[PDB]
Design a protein around this nucleic acid. Structure first.
Lengths: 367, 227, 137
RNA sequence: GAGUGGCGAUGAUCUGUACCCCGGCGGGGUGGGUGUCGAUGGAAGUCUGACCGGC
RNA sequence: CCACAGAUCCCACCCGGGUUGAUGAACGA
């Protein structure tokens, strides 16, 4: 009499005593195990079990599951089942261990790594990239600014007047990247990026009358490394935005209809997932970001933030201070609905949502 | 602020800016919270605030649970893992060594458990019916603690069945008794008595019986040892 | 100029660390086991940069970094049995943008260290003798 | 005779009454805290001296 | 009981420290 076990680990045959008579180890493949587990539910035996019942030639076999019995009878054997058998327990008692013994994994460390990922995939069968992307975007934003701030402080040793003349960081960087020295600056080369007639003249005059320092080619190229990094990041940023837009429309279209890909993703990031954002009340969504401000208010009974990361929505930060709280409240409300239609499936209804929102905003603005 | 160990492993109390005391656990995934809970740094180590009103285990502790059978490197079978609130705290307590097997049969909710379990190698999510331990027999191992919080009229019987499958002899079972989802008609206190008797008439040795009030209305938790 | 350069070096240092922490969290959606297998940020980045999909790793391309016989095998087996996510080429190149930026920044750093050494020996040779170019600056 | 346009959870109120001002409202200033950064700004603001050892 | 040893301790010279720092002094590119 042979007591048969089925597990992620493979197919093991025990005698009545609880000694492994023979085993066949499963392949360490997520795809195949998951399928065989799904199949086992309907009574279909593992393919490892089929091979094992051949190697041993047992007259009376006893399995764990009652659905398996008629399947193994159709295969030629006399079969029964015992529910919470001593054998089945004996096997699981030594299950941290017997994974290594039958060589399913080399050590315990990555038996559990595999089993964790099996479980993850096995329940998946029965938005993260959007989050990561925006998080990197935010890192890039932060860095562009840090480097541009540095570059201006650095490059102004040579050409100080250029700093207050070029507002735009990308433009400023393009100039240091293409030229270095201020005596390399030309009407021709500057037209070749679209700086307007009058501005080119002010730049060149400022470079002529500059009270900057005369400096080696080694010094300038040091600076130009930063300028090129800044230029690289701007391109990477724009690429990340388009990628983000792609995923965001796919994963949460209604939200994206409301606040754009970036800010939408940003809310997902803070919430942790789409389903988590979907479970939230508007009054939470309205304050995400701004945690320092919130808990300060909640601890002391002071005044709460009107808006967290939502501040970024154009209608809020451009509007006067007494309109902002209303706009925020209306936005958050709609976002909660947006997140929920996005989460609990499918339909795009972002057009009416926008329309309702802009109605609410137009009313707010007429006072 | 001040954080210090308690009688139980990996479970801490906070003195606060104002003079309040709240439970917390050692954050297994620093910088990341599962529900809305407060994250707290003290001496460069991060702790997750353990709200008793949400987590029945935190409740039971605050109602004076003698000895907690969930500690460093413990293996737990968690029936009724839900969205992952309490199970995330037992993940913190158990640390990378130990393992938690979260059984939960509501897909709407396992949705959010997934997110918790991705971030945490401790937790092995399972979308299955706790009434059929056969359907997860093939993923789990035997365990030290059977933590059972499932809304079912025959919840106790379900728990005993899982026990004789997976609970180690001399292991412990924390069983949450939900009076109102066994029977809204009967008195909560008559229910606690009759369910405990089911455990005793099996062979579970009732260690402690706590009433979860303030924190959970019409609830009691039983701690007992399987023989 | 000694001051500005070291300041920019401390910016780059800070960024390399921020991006590398981001990248590992990001690329770990696809190939999570690689994170604890590669301690060094520059190495990690080189992998995500050169290969892309986890199933595109190869022995000789890895021998080329300096990886010893034994490690190559652990990485490849980790990728085979990986419980990571199957993901599009759009998704991977998005991650790879950060990887290439990390690598760029490591070169810029080393370039800035050499530039700095030159200036620091010129402007403050005694201080440089004691604590090196960077710490002197 | 055909098509449109019609309160409402698929959602009104309460409090950021800021102060008071001139003409409920316009505008005004003074306010709050909060986003940015800055300035140069403000911080016992920049250790110690009798003998140290080896013998 | 003395004898002699022992090593310590200084003790002072002696040397080096040392008028180009003895001291103690709680970190954060």
């Amino acid at each position: 009499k042979i007591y048969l076990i089925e597990h992620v680990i493979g197919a093991v045959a025990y005698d009545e005593n609880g000694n492994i008579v023979d085993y066949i180890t499963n392949p360490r493949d997520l795809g195949k195990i998951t399928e065989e587990l799904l199949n086992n539910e309907k009574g279909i035996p593992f393919s490892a079990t089929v091979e094992l019942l051949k190697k041993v030639n047992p007259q009376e076999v006893v399995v764990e599951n009652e659905a398996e019995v008629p399947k193994l009878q159709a295969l030629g054997y006399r079969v029964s089942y015992e529910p919470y058998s001593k054998v089945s327990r004996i096997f699981r008692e030594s299950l941290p261990k017997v994974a290594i013994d039958i060589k399913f994994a080399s050590n315990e460390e990555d038996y559990y790594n595999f089993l964790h990922e099996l479980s993850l995939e096995y329940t998946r069968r029965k938005d993260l990239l959007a989050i990561q992307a925006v998080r990197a975007m935010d890192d890039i934003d932060k860095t562009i600014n840090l480097f541009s701030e540095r570059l201006r402080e650095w490059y102004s040793i040579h050409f100080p007047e250029l700093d207050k003349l070029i507002e735009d960081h990308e433009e400023y960087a393009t100039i240091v990247s293409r030229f270095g020295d201020r005596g390399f600056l030309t009407i021709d080369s500057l037209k070749e990026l679209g700086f307007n007639e009058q501005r080119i003249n002010r730049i060149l005059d400022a470079a002529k009358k500059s009270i900057g320092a005369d400096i080696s080619e080694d010094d300038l190229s040091a600076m130009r490394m930063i300028a090129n990094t800044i230029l690289d990041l701007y391109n990477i940023r724009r690429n990340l935005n388009n990628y983000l837009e792609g995923v965001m429309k796919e994963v949460a279209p209604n939200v994206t209809a409301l606040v754009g890909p970036a800010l939408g993703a940003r809310l997902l990031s803070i919430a942790g997932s789409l389903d988590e954002l979907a479970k939230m009340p508007a009054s939470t969504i309205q304050v995400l970001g701004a945690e320092k401000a919130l808990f300060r208010a909640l601890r002391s009974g002071g005044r709460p933030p009107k808006h967290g990361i939502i501040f970024q929505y154009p209608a809020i930060h451009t509007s006067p201070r007494w309109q902002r709280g209303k706009i925020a409240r209306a936005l958050a409300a709609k976002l909660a609905i947006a997140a929920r239609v996005d989460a609990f499936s499918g339909r795009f209804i972002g057009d009416q949502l926008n329309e309702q929102l802009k109605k609410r905003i137009d009313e707010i603005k007429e006072k | 602020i001040t954080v210090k160990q308690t009688n139980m492993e990996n479970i801490y109390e906070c003195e606060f800016n104002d003079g309040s005391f709240r439970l917390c656990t050692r954050n297994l995934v620093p910088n990341f919270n599962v529900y809305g809970e407060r994250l707290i740094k003290y001496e460069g180590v991060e702790y997750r605030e353990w709200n008793a009103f949400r987590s029945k285990l935190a409740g039971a502790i605050l109602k004076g649970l003698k000895t907690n059978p969930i500690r460093k490197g413990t293996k737990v079978l968690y029936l009724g893992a839900a969205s992952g609130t309490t199970i995330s705290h037992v993940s913190d307590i158990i640390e990378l060594n130990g393992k938690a097997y979260g059984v939960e049969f509501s897909p709407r909710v396992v949705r959010e458990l997934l997110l918790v379990a991705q971030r945490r190698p401790n937790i092995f999510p399972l979308l299955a019916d706790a009434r059929f331990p056969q359907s997860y027999k093939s993923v789990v191992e035997n365990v030290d603690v059977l933590y059972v919080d499932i809304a079912q009229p025959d919840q106790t019987d379900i728990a005993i069945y899982n026990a004789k499958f997976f609970l180690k002899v001399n292991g412990d079972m924390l069983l949450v008794i939900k009076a109102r989802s066994i029977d809204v008609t009967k008195d909560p206190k008559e229910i606690y008595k009759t369910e405990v008797e089911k455990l005793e008439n099996s062979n579970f040795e009732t260690i402690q019986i706590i009433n979860l009030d303030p924190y959970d209305k019409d609830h009691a938790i039983v701690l007992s040892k399987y023989k």
